[PDB]
Amino acid sequence: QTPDKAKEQHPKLETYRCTKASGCKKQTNYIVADAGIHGIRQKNGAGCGDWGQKPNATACPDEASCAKNCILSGMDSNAYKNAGITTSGNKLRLQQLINNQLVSPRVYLLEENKKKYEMLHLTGTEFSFDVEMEKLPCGMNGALYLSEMPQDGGKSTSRNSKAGAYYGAGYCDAQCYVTPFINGVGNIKGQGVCCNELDIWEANSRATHIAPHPCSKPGLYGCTGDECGSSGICDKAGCGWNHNRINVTDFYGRGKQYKVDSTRKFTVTSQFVANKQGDLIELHRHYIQDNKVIESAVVNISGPPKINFINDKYCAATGANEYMRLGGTKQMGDAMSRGMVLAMSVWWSEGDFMAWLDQGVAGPCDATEGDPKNIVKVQPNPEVTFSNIRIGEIGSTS
Ligand SMILES: OC[C@H]1O[C@@H](O[C@H]2[C@H](O)[C@@H](O)[C@H](O)O[C@@H]2CO)[C@H](O)[C@@H](O)[C@@H]1O
Ligand SMILES: *[C@@H]1O[C@H](CO)[C@@H](O)[C@H](O)[C@H]1NC(C)=O
Ligand SMILES: *[C@@H]1O[C@H](CO)[C@@H](O)[C@H](O)[C@H]1NC(C)=O
Questions:
Q1: Sequence-separated (6 or more) residues with CB below 8 Å from residue 348
Q2: Residue numbers of the domain that contains 188
Q3: Which cysteine-cysteine pairs are annotated as disulfide bonds in the entry?
């Protein structure tokens, strides 16, 4: 689409870069809402297409027409606030609903210049954030992850691409979903928009999940046919790590009966260990609550190695077949070494209620409380605050 001339007032967010020798140095970054949230419409107010489909065929018979006919409106602070996005110092607050409307924001981290995404190279490094999960019940998903999105939002791929990173263009992930816009241009062919993805944090106050999702194609790839499916180019399922699934049900949850208490602030530290060749080999996780390091628990089911971290042996032993098939941990680390975009979001699912995250073996939720209709009964304003993002040498961010 083509941005209008309305001012874009991206919320500011302080973040830190750290080393064992110098500590953590504060940096200014900006938050940008996804392109879709800005509002992309034709001149008669109609939209340019819905999630899961190609762009409206009348406004977008081709790319140039699509770019001319679909306008993206800039977002002032108010627009951000009404989209459920606000920031304060080093904190980012994401609200699922504002004035009774479903806003469910998805935002990306921008470099201080606002023209490009801050590309994070995590292989061999450490990443820490503080999170407030009390207001996220069964069925909710407060996510902090990385996607190998184009740094300029896809601008360089075409003369018709104008939104750029400045307006949140270029989203992609390992589900290869068909979105109306791809790389800032009309997705005339209806391709699935794929890319390597690292889910560092997918949670609610009842269950937490970690999951690297490798893809055999670097950067953003427009898949066609079977390239988009289960046996295609991206690992949809991922190699997951959820304490409940490896039978350690008292590790995380609401209250005093859990090692990490989801009703109170805590720190999440992730360490991406590389071997001598600089390849990713292991994903480690530990938490900090009440000034105490809480280490992850070792697998408590038979099958997988007795370790408290992700690795190819573990992944293969837990049935992540696509993960292994697409290159496993090393393939994931290559995408991380090339550089990826930090995405943060809040959402729910009318379709499966996030059962894969917090029901049966994944957690303590029944089969219906996670329904969005029930979610609002348990908690009228689901929300999540991610803050104090620190990236740097292993051993120096928390
Ligand atoms: O279901 C749409 C929903 O997706 C969220 O991104 C997912 C990504 O699709 C998936 O591949 C990965 O495994 O987890 C992330 C984070 O949950 C996105 O964050 C939402 O805004 C979006 O509504
Ligand atoms: C596509 O946009 C045109 C307006 O140019 C409108 O007539 C039509 O309803 C839109 N299609 C859909 C499927 O919304
Ligand atoms: C889960 O662990 C408990 C021991 O803490 C044990 O009683 C039970 O059999 C284990 N179940 C599985 C799925 O292995």
A1: 96, 104, 139, 140, 141, 354, 370, 372, 375, 382
A2: 2-398
A3: 18-24, 48-70, 60-66, 138-365, 172-195, 176-194, 215-234, 223-228, 239-315
Would you state the torsion angle of the CA atoms of residues 320, 211, 383, 363, taken in this order, to the nearest 10 degrees? 40
For the four alpha carbons of 329, 335, 338 and 341, in that order, the dihedral sign comes to: negative
Q: How was this structure determined?
A: X-ray
Structure tokens at 79: 């627009």
Tell me the DSSP string of 170-203: ---BTT--B-SEETTEE-TT--EEE--EEEEEEE
**Known active-site residue 282:** no
Atom of ligand 1 nearest to the CA of 202: 17
Gyration radius of the chain over CA positions: 20
234: domain CATH number is 2.70.100.10
Burial 178-217 (b: 16+ CB within 10 A, else e): bbbbbbbbbbbebbbbbbbbbbbbbbbbbbbbbbbbbbbb
56 lines ligand 2 (CB under 6 A): yes
164 CA from centroid of ligand 1 (Å): 21
Nearest ligand to the CA of 70 is 2
Give me the number of domains the chain comprises. 1
- Per DSSP, the three-state class of 92 is strand
Resolution number, Å: 2.3
